[PDB]
């Protein structure tokens, strides 16, 4: 009875008994047909929430899939040594600028 | 991807301070 | 089998390389170039190396209940630090170098003239 | 191809450009001091 | 109704069940029991959370579910569906963050220069 | 086209590192004269 | 004991077999006999090399064995995984390559600036 | 295309700023 999140080449889908609802999260590209809703790109990080009711075989049931996707195309991998070097040399350069301004004044 | 936007983000300062310097140079000279 | 127990699984959606030992026994001693590196971790059969961007190498044996497995050499050459030596890049590099040298030379010339 | 590192390299390049601008300012400032 | 809270600080992924805070809770990952048995340190049930270490995308991505201790686990109504590309010491920032850093750095540089200028005289 | 961006980024990184080193050399050159002047 | 020495230049990948000095030598890539025929692009194994032209990361990569004719492929003492990425005339930067350009640049800049200064003194 | 043109903009702006500051300092003198 759990909602079968189905993965295409670049799309996600949601299936349940009643019309695929929307309570919170991303809306996506709505399709008028029941049990078939695509959010579009997986890169947009789908994070929608789709409550639902029970089916005929499973009456008075509830399948709340809080579908969460984190495939970040904008992530970075910080390098601590590089960050420390950049910070230290920026501090040194700012100190030297202050030295020059003081020497002038 | 961050796209080629941070390069122009840095170039903004080099563009604006150059024309500020032009403004000061024209204010003090000629006119 | 042919005593080739070590294998590599790749093409995963994440970036990493892993070693799978196909020995039907527990406490299978891993190696790296004839040396003790790390004892087997029980309940898991996939020793970990790291990321493919690091360019892992070396031969990895796998000593099970029977004799040692034949080590599996690994080679990776993913370009992380590869630059492009086309026609444009060299011209840009030389032009920037020449302009900077000329500007510094003019500055130090004026410094000499003053002092 | 994984873009998780290319963004880090772009950030490093931006930081290097900022430091280059600061160093140019320092050298100009001190030469001007030598001239004044 | 209240959504789950997934926090990813590095490779460590912590999943918190916000629907049964008062009662003791145990976790199940795809209809099978996970955590709470203290079998390893990679998985571990905290006071009200499930702590997952060395996270992977093929395994450990599925219908996580939390059920109260001493209750029926099968009649579960809330199934988190998680698919995460988790990596060590990685963050998320767009152009706005680096723009903030650049502008603020200009700010401290200018402020410090003016401060030394006014203190020198 | 991500590979092209990678190549351009590393090329710019090395070029600006070289420019920073040149600036450091010039800073030493001017600092010696400034210290010997005052 | 004697590992595969693989040297990659440009967009072409060539790897060696310093394990059989002189003998007829065959190759296999993903359990498919690679080489021979008449070089549908240069893939044919050389005397002790297999040089690839227009190397494709996704299509041409995997387990490479180096065994002679009349021998079962399982008799090799070690397999090899080749997962390489190539591009048009790119080069890497090792530590000894970065430190070469850094030192050369510093020396040439210092020398030229000192020459200009000591010329402009008078 | 974009990065090379932006770096060209960087270089030309740096040179122009240097030249104009050098010209301004004579004028105020
Ligand atoms: C970044 C550029 C900073 C330039 C600071 C430039 C600071 O200039 C200070 C001078 O105007 C002081 O002149 P007097 O000694 O007459 O007072
Ligand atoms: C890009 C790098 C920018 C660096 C800026 C450094 C800027 C360094 O400026 C130094 C000032 O003392 C120059 O002031 P004036 O040009 O007004 O002096 C004219 C002469 N009298 C009027 C004072 C006698
Ligand atoms: C692009 C570069 C040149 C920008 C540098 C900073 C510009 C915006 C500002 C910062 C401090 C300014 C200087 C501060 C003080 C003086 C002394 C005054 O009697 C004439 C103008 C002059 C000389 C200003 C010229 C413009 C100046 C150099
Ligand atoms: C970018 C670095 C490497 C070099 C910068 C050189 C700059 C700082 C130098 C080059 C020539 C110099 C000028 C030479 C002569 C004069 C005339 C004098 O009455 C006022 C100062 C003034 C106007 C100098 C100001 C500083 C100056 C513009």
mmCIF file of N, CA and C in Angstrom, chain E residues 2 5 16-26 46-49 66-71:
data_model
loop_
_atom_site.group_PDB
_atom_site.id
_atom_site.type_symbol
_atom_site.label_atom_id
_atom_site.label_comp_id
_atom_site.label_asym_id
_atom_site.label_seq_id
_atom_site.Cartn_x
_atom_site.Cartn_y
_atom_site.Cartn_z
ATOM 1 N N UNK E 2 3.021 16.157 10.200
ATOM 2 C CA UNK E 2 4.312 16.780 10.465
ATOM 3 C C UNK E 2 5.401 16.034 9.711
ATOM 4 N N UNK E 5 12.343 14.907 9.663
ATOM 5 C CA UNK E 5 13.486 15.813 9.667
ATOM 6 C C UNK E 5 14.744 15.006 9.380
ATOM 7 N N UNK E 16 15.065 11.689 12.063
ATOM 8 C CA UNK E 16 14.312 11.909 13.290
ATOM 9 C C UNK E 16 12.830 11.725 13.010
ATOM 10 N N UNK E 17 12.150 10.975 13.876
ATOM 11 C CA UNK E 17 10.721 10.752 13.725
ATOM 12 C C UNK E 17 9.971 11.724 14.621
ATOM 13 N N UNK E 18 9.327 12.752 14.070
ATOM 14 C CA UNK E 18 8.694 13.791 14.896
ATOM 15 C C UNK E 18 7.248 13.521 15.288
ATOM 16 N N UNK E 19 6.751 12.295 15.137
ATOM 17 C CA UNK E 19 5.342 12.016 15.381
ATOM 18 C C UNK E 19 5.079 11.274 16.684
ATOM 19 N N UNK E 20 6.089 10.634 17.269
ATOM 20 C CA UNK E 20 5.955 9.952 18.557
ATOM 21 C C UNK E 20 7.107 10.366 19.463
ATOM 22 N N UNK E 21 7.105 11.610 19.947
ATOM 23 C CA UNK E 21 8.219 12.066 20.789
ATOM 24 C C UNK E 21 8.120 11.565 22.221
ATOM 25 N N UNK E 22 6.897 11.470 22.744
ATOM 26 C CA UNK E 22 6.724 11.048 24.124
ATOM 27 C C UNK E 22 7.085 9.593 24.354
ATOM 28 N N UNK E 23 6.711 8.721 23.423
ATOM 29 C CA UNK E 23 6.883 7.287 23.597
ATOM 30 C C UNK E 23 8.207 6.812 23.009
ATOM 31 N N UNK E 24 8.727 5.725 23.577
ATOM 32 C CA UNK E 24 9.950 5.117 23.068
ATOM 33 C C UNK E 24 9.696 4.533 21.684
ATOM 34 N N UNK E 25 10.643 4.733 20.770
ATOM 35 C CA UNK E 25 10.443 4.427 19.360
ATOM 36 C C UNK E 25 11.584 3.546 18.868
ATOM 37 N N UNK E 26 11.257 2.607 17.986
ATOM 38 C CA UNK E 26 12.222 1.792 17.264
ATOM 39 C C UNK E 26 11.974 1.948 15.770
ATOM 40 N N UNK E 46 19.238 6.783 18.858
ATOM 41 C CA UNK E 46 19.478 7.731 19.936
ATOM 42 C C UNK E 46 18.216 7.832 20.790
ATOM 43 N N UNK E 47 18.137 8.871 21.626
ATOM 44 C CA UNK E 47 16.984 9.030 22.509
ATOM 45 C C UNK E 47 15.681 9.076 21.720
ATOM 46 N N UNK E 48 15.654 9.839 20.626
ATOM 47 C CA UNK E 48 14.470 9.900 19.778
ATOM 48 C C UNK E 48 14.817 9.903 18.296
ATOM 49 N N UNK E 49 16.046 9.556 17.923
ATOM 50 C CA UNK E 49 16.499 9.644 16.544
ATOM 51 C C UNK E 49 17.185 8.348 16.139
ATOM 52 N N UNK E 66 9.118 4.669 11.429
ATOM 53 C CA UNK E 66 9.295 4.665 12.872
ATOM 54 C C UNK E 66 8.036 4.128 13.539
ATOM 55 N N UNK E 67 8.211 3.237 14.516
ATOM 56 C CA UNK E 67 7.075 2.686 15.242
ATOM 57 C C UNK E 67 7.355 2.731 16.738
ATOM 58 N N UNK E 68 6.334 2.962 17.558
ATOM 59 C CA UNK E 68 6.547 3.010 19.009
ATOM 60 C C UNK E 68 6.962 1.660 19.572
ATOM 61 N N UNK E 69 7.746 1.711 20.646
ATOM 62 C CA UNK E 69 8.172 0.493 21.321
ATOM 63 C C UNK E 69 7.009 -0.128 22.085
ATOM 64 N N UNK E 70 6.887 -1.450 21.988
ATOM 65 C CA UNK E 70 5.805 -2.150 22.650
ATOM 66 C C UNK E 70 4.478 -2.095 21.932
ATOM 67 N N UNK E 71 4.469 -1.693 20.663
ATOM 68 C CA UNK E 71 3.251 -1.577 19.877
ATOM 69 C C UNK E 71 3.390 -2.403 18.607
#
